Design an enzyme around this catalytic site. Structure first.
Site, PDB file in Angstrom:
ATOM      1  N   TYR A  34      37.511  40.225  36.350  1.00 31.59           N
ATOM      2  CA  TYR A  34      37.510  41.474  37.095  1.00 31.59           C
ATOM      3  C   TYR A  34      37.489  42.729  36.238  1.00 31.59           C
ATOM      4  CZ  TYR A  34      38.407  45.268  40.244  1.00 31.59           C
ATOM      5  OH  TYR A  34      38.278  46.466  40.906  1.00 31.59           O
ATOM      6  N   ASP A  67      37.383  32.795  35.530  1.00 30.11           N
ATOM      7  CA  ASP A  67      37.926  33.185  36.831  1.00 30.11           C
ATOM      8  C   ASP A  67      37.211  34.344  37.518  1.00 30.11           C
ATOM      9  OD1 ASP A  67      40.592  32.771  38.594  1.00 30.11           O
ATOM     10  OD2 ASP A  67      40.176  34.926  38.459  1.00 30.11           O
ATOM     11  N   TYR A  94      35.394  40.446  43.555  1.00 29.71           N
ATOM     12  CA  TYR A  94      35.048  41.107  42.289  1.00 29.71           C
ATOM     13  C   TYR A  94      33.641  41.688  42.173  1.00 29.71           C
ATOM     14  CZ  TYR A  94      39.253  38.497  40.940  1.00 29.71           C
ATOM     15  OH  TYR A  94      40.515  37.954  40.940  1.00 29.71           O
ATOM     16  N   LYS A 117      36.966  32.595  44.742  1.00 27.89           N
ATOM     17  CA  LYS A 117      37.983  32.690  45.776  1.00 27.89           C
ATOM     18  C   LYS A 117      37.449  33.177  47.114  1.00 27.89           C
ATOM     19  CE  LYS A 117      40.968  34.182  41.939  1.00 27.89           C
ATOM     20  NZ  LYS A 117      40.103  35.003  41.065  1.00 27.89           N
ATOM     21  N   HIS A 121      42.119  33.301  48.344  1.00 25.94           N
ATOM     22  CA  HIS A 121      42.515  34.442  47.525  1.00 25.94           C
ATOM     23  C   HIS A 121      43.903  35.017  47.836  1.00 25.94           C
ATOM     24  CE1 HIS A 121      40.392  37.720  44.943  1.00 25.94           C
ATOM     25  NE2 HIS A 121      41.684  37.682  44.661  1.00 25.94           N
ATOM     26  N   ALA A 154      48.852  38.512  33.295  1.00 25.97           N
ATOM     27  CA  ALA A 154      49.718  37.961  32.261  1.00 25.97           C
ATOM     28  C   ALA A 154      49.861  38.892  31.053  1.00 25.97           C
ATOM     29  CB  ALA A 154      49.187  36.602  31.815  1.00 25.97           C
ATOM     30  N   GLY A 193      49.997  42.211  31.512  1.00 22.62           N
ATOM     31  CA  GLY A 193      50.468  43.469  32.067  1.00 22.62           C
ATOM     32  C   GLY A 193      49.548  44.226  33.005  1.00 22.62           C
ATOM     33  N   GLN A 210      40.227  37.477  19.928  1.00 20.91           N
ATOM     34  CA  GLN A 210      41.626  37.407  19.521  1.00 20.91           C
ATOM     35  C   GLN A 210      42.423  36.511  20.465  1.00 20.91           C
ATOM     36  OE1 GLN A 210      45.349  40.130  20.171  1.00 20.91           O
ATOM     37  NE2 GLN A 210      43.867  41.249  18.916  1.00 20.91           N
TER      38      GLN A 210
HETATM   39  N1  LIG Z   1      44.094  36.055  42.569  1.00 24.95           N
HETATM   40  C1  LIG Z   1      44.532  37.273  42.421  1.00 24.95           C
HETATM   41  O1  LIG Z   1      45.141  37.841  43.298  1.00 24.95           O
HETATM   42  C2  LIG Z   1      44.277  38.062  41.121  1.00 24.95           C
HETATM   43  C3  LIG Z   1      44.795  39.426  40.960  1.00 24.95           C
HETATM   44  C4  LIG Z   1      44.532  40.105  39.732  1.00 24.95           C
HETATM   45  C5  LIG Z   1      43.775  39.486  38.685  1.00 24.95           C
HETATM   46  N2  LIG Z   1      43.285  38.150  38.909  1.00 24.95           N
HETATM   47  C6  LIG Z   1      42.442  37.490  37.832  1.00 24.95           C
HETATM   48  O2  LIG Z   1      43.181  37.328  36.571  1.00 24.95           O
HETATM   49  C7  LIG Z   1      42.576  38.180  35.548  1.00 24.95           C
HETATM   50  C8  LIG Z   1      43.551  38.870  34.635  1.00 24.95           C
HETATM   51  O3  LIG Z   1      44.354  39.800  35.388  1.00 24.95           O
HETATM   52  P1  LIG Z   1      44.209  41.337  35.128  1.00 24.95           P
HETATM   53  O4  LIG Z   1      42.886  41.763  35.601  1.00 24.95           O
HETATM   54  O5  LIG Z   1      45.377  42.091  35.658  1.00 24.95           O
HETATM   55  O6  LIG Z   1      44.222  41.472  33.570  1.00 24.95           O
HETATM   56  P2  LIG Z   1      45.194  41.153  32.385  1.00 24.95           P
HETATM   57  O7  LIG Z   1      44.628  39.944  31.701  1.00 24.95           O
HETATM   58  O8  LIG Z   1      46.544  41.338  32.774  1.00 24.95           O
HETATM   59  O9  LIG Z   1      44.751  42.407  31.548  1.00 24.95           O
HETATM   60  C9  LIG Z   1      45.115  42.571  30.210  1.00 24.95           C
HETATM   61  C10 LIG Z   1      44.536  43.982  29.941  1.00 24.95           C
HETATM   62  O10 LIG Z   1      44.902  44.142  28.537  1.00 24.95           O
HETATM   63  C11 LIG Z   1      43.804  44.279  27.672  1.00 24.95           C
HETATM   64  N3  LIG Z   1      43.765  43.192  26.724  1.00 24.95           N
HETATM   65  C12 LIG Z   1      43.206  41.931  26.781  1.00 24.95           C
HETATM   66  N4  LIG Z   1      43.389  41.203  25.694  1.00 24.95           N
HETATM   67  C13 LIG Z   1      44.117  42.055  24.871  1.00 24.95           C
HETATM   68  C14 LIG Z   1      44.616  41.848  23.575  1.00 24.95           C
HETATM   69  N5  LIG Z   1      44.487  40.738  22.829  1.00 24.95           N
HETATM   70  N6  LIG Z   1      45.329  42.911  22.988  1.00 24.95           N
HETATM   71  C15 LIG Z   1      45.528  44.118  23.675  1.00 24.95           C
HETATM   72  N7  LIG Z   1      45.046  44.347  24.957  1.00 24.95           N
HETATM   73  C16 LIG Z   1      44.350  43.285  25.511  1.00 24.95           C
HETATM   74  C17 LIG Z   1      42.533  44.263  28.548  1.00 24.95           C
HETATM   75  O11 LIG Z   1      41.786  45.429  28.295  1.00 24.95           O
HETATM   76  P3  LIG Z   1      40.370  45.361  27.500  1.00 24.95           P
HETATM   77  O12 LIG Z   1      39.337  44.901  28.537  1.00 24.95           O
HETATM   78  O13 LIG Z   1      40.205  46.776  27.083  1.00 24.95           O
HETATM   79  O14 LIG Z   1      40.550  44.344  26.404  1.00 24.95           O
HETATM   80  C18 LIG Z   1      42.985  44.042  29.973  1.00 24.95           C
HETATM   81  O15 LIG Z   1      42.623  45.126  30.831  1.00 24.95           O
HETATM   82  C19 LIG Z   1      41.520  39.052  36.327  1.00 24.95           C
HETATM   83  O16 LIG Z   1      40.407  39.493  35.539  1.00 24.95           O
HETATM   84  C20 LIG Z   1      41.154  38.158  37.488  1.00 24.95           C
HETATM   85  O17 LIG Z   1      40.167  37.199  37.126  1.00 24.95           O
HETATM   86  C21 LIG Z   1      43.539  37.449  40.113  1.00 24.95           C
HETATM   87  C1  LIG Z   2      51.011  41.057  47.539  1.00 23.36           C
HETATM   88  C2  LIG Z   2      50.077  40.303  46.500  1.00 23.36           C
HETATM   89  C3  LIG Z   2      48.852  39.875  47.095  1.00 23.36           C
HETATM   90  C4  LIG Z   2      47.571  40.731  46.688  1.00 23.36           C
HETATM   91  C5  LIG Z   2      46.416  39.792  46.497  1.00 23.36           C
HETATM   92  C6  LIG Z   2      45.004  40.500  46.464  1.00 23.36           C
HETATM   93  O1  LIG Z   2      44.016  39.479  46.719  1.00 23.36           O
HETATM   94  C7  LIG Z   2      44.698  41.166  45.193  1.00 23.36           C
HETATM   95  C8  LIG Z   2      43.501  41.431  44.774  1.00 23.36           C
HETATM   96  C9  LIG Z   2      43.056  42.087  43.551  1.00 23.36           C
HETATM   97  C10 LIG Z   2      42.139  41.184  42.622  1.00 23.36           C
HETATM   98  O2  LIG Z   2      42.067  39.969  42.609  1.00 23.36           O
HETATM   99  C11 LIG Z   2      41.432  42.189  41.780  1.00 23.36           C
HETATM  100  C12 LIG Z   2      41.058  43.206  42.740  1.00 23.36           C
HETATM  101  O3  LIG Z   2      40.678  44.396  42.088  1.00 23.36           O
HETATM  102  C13 LIG Z   2      42.104  43.337  43.810  1.00 23.36           C
HETATM  103  C14 LIG Z   2      42.783  44.696  43.921  1.00 23.36           C
HETATM  104  C15 LIG Z   2      43.584  44.922  45.078  1.00 23.36           C
HETATM  105  C16 LIG Z   2      43.320  45.213  46.376  1.00 23.36           C
HETATM  106  C17 LIG Z   2      41.961  45.394  46.993  1.00 23.36           C
HETATM  107  C18 LIG Z   2      42.129  45.607  48.493  1.00 23.36           C
HETATM  108  C19 LIG Z   2      40.876  46.112  49.189  1.00 23.36           C
HETATM  109  C20 LIG Z   2      40.010  45.104  49.848  1.00 23.36           C
HETATM  110  O4  LIG Z   2      40.354  44.650  50.900  1.00 23.36           O
HETATM  111  O5  LIG Z   2      39.075  44.664  49.138  1.00 23.36           O
END
Ligand SMILES: NC(=O)c1ccc[n+]([C@@H]2O[C@H](COP(=O)([O-])OP(=O)(O)OC[C@H]3O[C@@H](n4cnc5c(N)ncnc54)[C@H](OP(=O)(O)O)[C@@H]3O)[C@@H](O)[C@H]2O)c1
Ligand SMILES: CCCCC[C@H](O)/C=C/[C@H]1C(=O)C[C@H](O)[C@@H]1C/C=C\CCCC(=O)O
Length: 319
Positions: A20, A46, A51, A80, A113, A214, A216, A275
């Site tokens: 994402y 993922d 997305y 998803k 999702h 994971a 932040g 990294q």
């Molecule tokens: N199912 C769900 O509800 C849900 C919700 C949120 C996310 N997800 C999925 O899980 C993924 C990860 O979650 P997230 O989007 O919140 O991201 P995250 O992995 O928590 O993001 C880490 C952030 O830190 C930076 N980063 C990455 N590697 C680094 C490193 N080695 N050192 C310093 N900074 C680093 C990245 O920026 P740079 O790009 O600048 O490196 C990135 O924006 C998503 O892309 C998505 O596929 C699923």
């Molecule tokens: C309370 C926790 C449950 C939340 C789960 C939710 O699926 C989260 C989704 C996020 C991702 O996966 C990445 C994506 O940017 C998205 C951001 C959050 C909300 C979009 C809502 C608008 C819509 O309707 O599109």
């Protein structure tokens, strides 16, 4: 890398690439970085309908297969089902559309999702005349029945859920005539919200906990309070980073691997992508782990207050 055997018999690489990126980033970027990720060694990718990048991610995968760099079976691709397609009759069609966008024959993992159903439709965020997102009431067990059908039809090798709490998980697990248990539960998980209780429960039912945000989160000002503490700036994480001569991100990622959690990591930066694969190069001590365990502050990066009223809001329970 390394893999974990699902209660499916299938295998999931313990390190996954998060795809994402905000709508402000060019969609061509998703294509470029997914290639970089695979080249770096990422095998688990993922994505999701929400997305708006399955076309590009599938393109990268197809490109690296043609490259001769990898074979389809070497890649673990997950998509998803968005919340507006929870009604059983919209499940297969939603999956087929994702498969069509990605130009793939099957998805290695398909997930619900989120448990919070939304009004059926093509629009991802349906809102009424007062600008409020419209909820829908759906028996998630019927949504699951449709998911099991997708697995039987070979469109998804494995099926699981995302953002489910213990009670919601139990609803599926106790469903009469259940055929397939969810293989995983992808939830927000990091040192400031480690989900130990949920983790223990999932472990007790052979369900894999997959951690997102994971590192932040991406701190999108649209859903993340700029005042929330910056995870990668945590004193203990940075102290452990300087100690092991790694980075706070690698510490956060390694923490999950050592506690049996599959970790996702998003990065659209060439060097950082490379990294992150080094997470397999070092180890945290038992004491290091306890120290990180003490960082939990029940902090959820996503501003989910607006949906707090949803009957399926997952954060209603202690876990
Ligand atoms: N199912 C769900 O509800 C849900 C919700 C949120 C996310 N997800 C999925 O899980 C993924 C990860 O979650 P997230 O989007 O919140 O991201 P995250 O992995 O928590 O993001 C880490 C952030 O830190 C930076 N980063 C990455 N590697 C680094 C490193 N080695 N050192 C310093 N900074 C680093 C990245 O920026 P740079 O790009 O600048 O490196 C990135 O924006 C998503 O892309 C998505 O596929 C699923
Ligand atoms: C309370 C926790 C449950 C939340 C789960 C939710 O699926 C989260 C989704 C996020 C991702 O996966 C990445 C994506 O940017 C998205 C951001 C959050 C909300 C979009 C809502 C608008 C819509 O309707 O599109």
């Amino acid at each position: 890398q390394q893999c974990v055997k699902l209660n499916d018999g299938h295998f999931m690489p313990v390190l996954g690439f998060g795809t994402y990126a905000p709508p402000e980033v060019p969609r061509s970027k998703a294509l470029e970085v997914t290639k970089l990720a695979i080249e770096a060694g990422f095998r688990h990718i993922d994505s999701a309908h929400l997305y708006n990048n399955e076309e590009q991610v599938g393109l990268a995968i197809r490109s690296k297969i043609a490259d001769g760099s990898v074979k389809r079976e070497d890649i673990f691709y997950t998509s998803k089902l968005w919340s507006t397609f929870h009604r059983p009759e919209l499940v297969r069609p939603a999956l087929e559309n994702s498969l069509k966008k990605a130009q793939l024959d099957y998805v290695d993992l398909y997930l619900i999702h989120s448990p919070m159903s939304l009004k059926p439709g093509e629009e991802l965020s349906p809102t009424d005349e007062n600008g409020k997102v419209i909820f829908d009431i759906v028996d998630l067990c019927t949504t699951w029945e449709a998911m099991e059908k997708c697995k039987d039809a070979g469109l998804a090798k494995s099926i699981g859920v995302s953002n489910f709490n213990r009670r919601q998980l139990e609803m599926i697990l106790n469903k009469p005539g259940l055929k397939y248990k969810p293989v995983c539960n992808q939830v927000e998980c990091h040192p400031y919200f480690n989900r130990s209780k949920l983790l223990d429960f999932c472990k007790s039912k052979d369900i894999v906990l997959v951690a997102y945000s994971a590192l932040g989160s991406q701190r999108d000002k649209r859903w993340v309070d700029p005042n929330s503490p910056v995870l990668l700036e945590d004193p203990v994480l940075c102290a452990l980073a300087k100690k092991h001569k790694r980075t706070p991100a690698l510490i956060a990622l390694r923490y999950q691997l050592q506690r049996g959690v599959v970790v996702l990591a998003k990065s659209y930066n060439e060097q950082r992508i490379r990294q992150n694969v080094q997470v397999f190069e070092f180890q945290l001590t038992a004491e290091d782990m306890k120290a990180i365990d003490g960082l939990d502050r029940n902090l959820h990066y996503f501003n989910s207050d607006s949906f707090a009223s949803h009957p399926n809001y997952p954060y209603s329970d202690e876990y």
